[PDB]
Amino acid sequence: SIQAFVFCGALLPIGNRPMIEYVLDWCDQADGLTSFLSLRKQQFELIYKALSNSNHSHHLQDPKKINFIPSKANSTGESLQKELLPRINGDFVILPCDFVTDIPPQVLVDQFRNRDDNNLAMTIYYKNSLDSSIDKKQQQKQKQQQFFTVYSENEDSERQPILLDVYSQRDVTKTKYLQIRSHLLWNYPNLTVSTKLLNSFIYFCSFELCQLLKLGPQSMSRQASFKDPFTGNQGIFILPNETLFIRANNLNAYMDANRFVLKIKSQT
Amino acid sequence: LEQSFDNSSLISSVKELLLNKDLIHPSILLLTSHLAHYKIVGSIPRCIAMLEVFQIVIKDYQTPKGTTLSRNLTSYLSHQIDLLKKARPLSVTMGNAIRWLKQEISLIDPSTPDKAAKKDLCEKIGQFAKEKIELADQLIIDNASTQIEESTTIVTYGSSKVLTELLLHNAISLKKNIKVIVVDSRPLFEGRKMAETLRNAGVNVMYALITSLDTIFNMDVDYVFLGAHSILSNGFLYSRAGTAMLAMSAKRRNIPVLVCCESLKFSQRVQLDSVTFNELADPNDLVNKNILDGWQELPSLNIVNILYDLTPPEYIKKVITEFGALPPSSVPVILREYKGSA
Amino acid sequence: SDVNVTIDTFVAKLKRRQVQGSYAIALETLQLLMRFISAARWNHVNDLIEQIRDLGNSLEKAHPTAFSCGNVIRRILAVLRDEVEEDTMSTTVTSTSVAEPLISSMFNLLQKPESSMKTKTDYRQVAIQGIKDLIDEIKNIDEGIQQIAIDLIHDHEILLTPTPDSKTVLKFLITARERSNRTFTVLVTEGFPNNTKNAHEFAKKLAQHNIETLVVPDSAVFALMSRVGKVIIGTKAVFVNGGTISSNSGVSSVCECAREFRTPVFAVAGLYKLSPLYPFDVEKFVEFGGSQRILPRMDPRKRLDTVNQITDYVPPENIDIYITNVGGFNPSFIYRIAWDNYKQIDVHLDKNKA
Amino acid sequence: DSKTVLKFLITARERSNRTFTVLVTEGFPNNTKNAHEFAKKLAQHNIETLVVPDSAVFALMSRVGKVIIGTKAVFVNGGTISSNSGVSSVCECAREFRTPVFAVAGLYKLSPLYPFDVEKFVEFGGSQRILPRMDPRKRLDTVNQITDYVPPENIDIYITNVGGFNPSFIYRIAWDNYKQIDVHLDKNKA
């Protein structure tokens, strides 16, 4: 069934709990949120785990296999392909390094339930939240994302919205200036893209370890370039998905996690 | 309050369970998730889909130590049925399969090493729907086709369950001329699934709504065929809501009405009133800022949504099953001769 | 002239549905009609009916299926068609007044031989009040409705209407709860997908006056018909058979389903909602709608066909009573009220008297 | 005069706690002995009951939409041999308003015979209690009737011990209990 997996890549945790730990019991808060197991690298685990294995009367069944090579020593796209053949059990869920939230994944695995659209991966994301102001930092490093934003107002078709391609600043907007293949436009041709869409790295997954074996998706680094090719005829192949929401959650990507915990994440 | 059918307690709106004594199959929650949030079934689609998850859930046996496989699965599978009862109460297409399945739980002995437990159950419960459904529907095909001439019309109601395959056979597999009249109703627009399919099949389809029903009958029209949900022991057709209004009118307008059905869709129970034994389904659905909101909290307002309703058997002219055709008063004689006997 | 362009913009008002309903078009065809009365020089009393019969044929041929405008022009002719014979025999000496309103209509065509002295101008001003007394009748038709229907209906019975788009019973069931303090309920269905705009508007205002109301869907109305033993139908127009031209959608088959359970079927109609014409074809008065709001996908390549309908017609055998301002009446009696308001000449309202 | 529904509507109020009323007419002038006895015991179990006269039963038939008839015997047509008096025409008046017509009958109340003549099973009564004056010189004539028969078209269901059944299905229950020889129960097998 559902399986967890955590990636990794100042380091001192500010909000009175370890940075690495914030996805351990948070993804398994109640019954429901129970995956099969979670996996992690070493990351000097003795400080982390000895406090993480405290207060035990709760059947904390924690197996955790350790590697070292997909830990910024190798690209986590191609290196993960060999790291799944003993790891496969059923459906997959990956986790980013230091994710935080407010609304629990109990309603996010509810989004994984009613997925009879023979999907392979849905991606629950969110944009930027309400920031401070016109900041005293550098310019807006905007990840220009290439996707379909709002829900489909059409029955039976892309009933959750679709991520189509994936790019950012400095790759296309500074070389080819936002060019899109009109061929990949032809499937669901009424798209909407945004700029503040924070790649939440959550990435509900499925049995494409049985079906990644054809050539073309095997050269994928960064774990998103599978619908970045249209993968069709010059019919269409399998489909991705994407989901987001309105308010009342968190995450962190940048060095602003020092100030995310200051005024936004206060706990009482 | 004078009829007090709002206080007819055939269903509630209870949800939000958390119990984990049983090992609940995750995929059978998906079946209940696929029903109650937005209904995607007829009755024999359920009888397929209820069987679709049953072959999977028996494959994960998980038989405990001091318990025979005859002793646990009569509790294990039946505890998962109550998950469906929270979503939607059963049909006879539900009901006749599961009591037949509980026979098969009981007729096994403590001899199976659980490797043999697949194929004595798997093909057997596969040969159930192979015989009781699939080639049962094959005998529907030849029987209805000889009762239909070319260049005529068919009036259906809602999403059909078996006569979709009948209309495919006469339009494509026999190529005789035919015009199709599909009518469905607010809120469940399940007849549009047929309206997509038969014009994807390339045949003359005239979609309709039940409020405009007279002007269909004011044209060249005959051969009203119907889907079904169960047949009463009298001859009443317990079926989808709004079936009887065309069934009274077409019988009033002296053109015959048939009900495509099967012996699996018979029943031992009997009644003769529409609002006695039924199911309500989430009164928020008949709304779509909207026009009104607040059937709750406002004085003197309620939304009903009838799912099932009876039709008098005098409206039905001929009842066709896989064994053949029969007049509607002669329904319960198969209950002593084939159902549990054949 | 200036009245000849106000009729043209009124002709333009009746093309693209610049007014709807059986109420407001009758007031506005009549206020506009007084401009033609005040600017006419007929010079002979048979010219003035010629001044108006072509105008109706400039109106009824312009748009047939509206009738609250179509029946006024014949009735306001009939008040002058009365007074031609008034000044005819009063001009003569021998048989000045018999004054019995009914002569045997079979024999009248079958016997053919071949102070206010004249006061030729009075046909104008008696139509000027003929403008006024018609509208003032229309303003309070509901008092003759409410005098007889609380007599006709009783206290403790569940009810049903298929016409939420009837401002009569929208206003009537207020005072049917208010003055007469009878408690009951009303089932209400939708005119899907057209009066469901007003069907949700209908029971909400009745929820304010809290008459135990609940909305049924259109498919369920057979399944609860066994409980209810009384239905009222707010119609739009009514013809000589007692077959009435109803409101938009869904109301004919449920009027049929009511009749099959031996349930009495009620109707309300103002006296100006009468029409002296005959329903020759049912389908020349059954107006349809659009393929837009009955399925919005608009496939050009699959491209099925679908039918809407924004007029239902019922036979008089499916109806029982006519709650009017002047009493309740048989479905077959409708001629005698009508021929006390209309004449046999202008029912064939056309210049070609072939 | 049906001890079935006399006993049944006790527990139809008691176990199932449904509240309703029953109109009750008289079998004039014969079951009016028991008609006043009937609603009184139902007044003890207080099911909102009220006694109607026999003439009024059309005038309140528009209100009521369900009638039950406790019959005495039942034949192969589904035409049943009912109780004493008054029940056939009101079963007809019920059918005209498209009202469902109920009946209760034990399985031993079945009969494998056919109603050839209706009048050979319609038994009458006496001239005594229908007028007591007994004039010998004026001496009019008058008719009593202590058996009513209904056609199966005026009946809808047979609430029995083995289920509810069609008016036309009655043979199959009967021929599962009777044979074709002794229905002509006579020594002369002509």
Place this chain on the structure above:
Amino acid sequence: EDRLQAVVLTDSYETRFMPLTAVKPRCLLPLANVPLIEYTLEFLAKAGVHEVFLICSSHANQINDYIENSKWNLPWSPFKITTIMSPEARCTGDVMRDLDNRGIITGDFILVSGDVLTNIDFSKMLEFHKKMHLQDKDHISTMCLSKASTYPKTRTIEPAAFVLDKSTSRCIYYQDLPLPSSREKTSIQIDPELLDNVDEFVIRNDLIDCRIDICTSHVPLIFQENFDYQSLRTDFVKGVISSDILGKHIYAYLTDEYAVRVESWQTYDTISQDFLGRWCYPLVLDSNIQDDQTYSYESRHIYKEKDVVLAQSCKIGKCTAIGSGTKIGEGTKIENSVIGRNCQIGENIRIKNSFIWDDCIIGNNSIIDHSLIASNATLGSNVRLNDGCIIGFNVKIDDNMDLDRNTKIS
């Protein structure tokens, strides 16, 4: 607010209908037994206008005499009607600048290019345009378009792809999508320098073009000195938004229902059937306004006038329309096709999906499929047709003539 000016221009698609159009304009051609001048004219009669300005770059003499025989030269019409003659090949926009050099047009006014047909209200378009006035003084216009939802790639001639704002619906850029059956030219380009103050913006395809735009009189003066623009949207709506002029905001508008414009015969194939069906609610055919027709409606979309001689045993199928002066024969078949007025139908002919115009006599045993026939073109016996026969005006056809696909004969 008041004084609703307008500008109507036909005569841009003479390239499109070249087997026809030699004797009469495209706008004069009958859609359903009546032309499509007045489809626009009654639609801007719904607009409540005061004056129009015609453009007749060709066939100019046979325009105004039809207006002389219309109701529009008779003084109760919503507008007085004015025409402007012109020589041939006077393209769009250059018709504007010479008119702008004349300069009659004041304030707001109505561009109708091509020939349009719709059901959209004039009301909710215009306060939306006034909402742009209350949100911007550097505004340009509001381009109302529909949503061809279930069908991409069947807007026949040109596929148009639009990118616009989420909130303000400011059209960001236009780039013409290539031919969808051509799988080769697979690239669009939008320069992101002008994408500054939007940051959530919608890029669509299914906005079906109808060229129905209304705008102020300042933007043709902007269009005046920029004399190197030759089209409406192929060059000008790009260059006004591709950063060359600074701070100029053009909006579009989307509606949820019917609006369309004729491009080819394939557009003339589809929307004729859509208008014959109830897809043109409320602007329906039995209104009978224009040549004050006598059509009576019957079910399965039957449009019969009076004086219609229907023979015995001739089945009339769905989606048909019959004028007066017509006579069908025995054993023919009428299905899914308009029929011209004042024509003759012989014996055993299966008219199917073919738009036969006025004064046509069809010989016996000559079935017609997907083959519209213009005026005065009679036939003979055993004249078999197929797809794309767009045979023209007054064409005598002898017996036994079978034809091939796309027979554009005259």
